[PDB]
C-alpha cells in the first residue's frame, strides 16, 4: 500500500516562533512544449495511387 509521506507534527504554542538564521540558493528546471510537426496530406496519391 502506497505511503502518502512522512508523518510530522508542529510544536504550536501560545507564545513561540521559529526564525531562520541561514539560507540556501536553489536552481530548478522546467520543460514546456511549444510547437509540433507540420504535416501535409495529398488526397489524390493517398486514396487513388496511380
Amino acid at each position: 500500500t502506497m505511503s502518502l509521506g512522512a508523518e510530522n507534527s508542529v510544536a504550536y504554542s501560545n507564545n513561540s516562533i521559529a526564525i531562520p538564521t541561514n539560507f540556501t540558493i536553489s536552481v530548478t528546471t522546467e520543460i514546456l512544449p511549444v510547437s509540433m510537426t507540420k504535416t501535409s496530406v495529398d488526397c489524390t496519391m493517398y486514396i487513388c495511387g496511380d
Binding site: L4, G5, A6, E7, N8, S9, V10, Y12
Partner: protein
C-alpha cells in the same frame, strides 16, 4: 459469434487506437488528482489543544 471475429479481422486495426485513447484518458484522470492534491511532502498533525 465466432464468425464475426473472423470478419472483423478484415478491417485492420480498429481496436488498438480506441484502447490506447481510453488508457491515456484514464492516466490523465489520475494525473489530474495527483497534481491538484499531492502538494505537500509531509503529513502534519494538529495539536491536541
Amino acid at each position: 459469434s465466432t464468425e464475426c471475429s473472423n470478419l472483423l479481422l478484415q478491417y485492420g486495426s480498429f481496436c488498438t487506437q480506441l484502447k490506447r485513447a481510453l488508457t491515456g484518458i484514464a492516466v490523465e484522470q489520475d494525473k489530474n488528482t495527483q497534481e491538484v492534491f499531492a502538494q505537500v511532502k509531509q503529513i502534519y498533525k494538529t495539536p491536541p489543544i
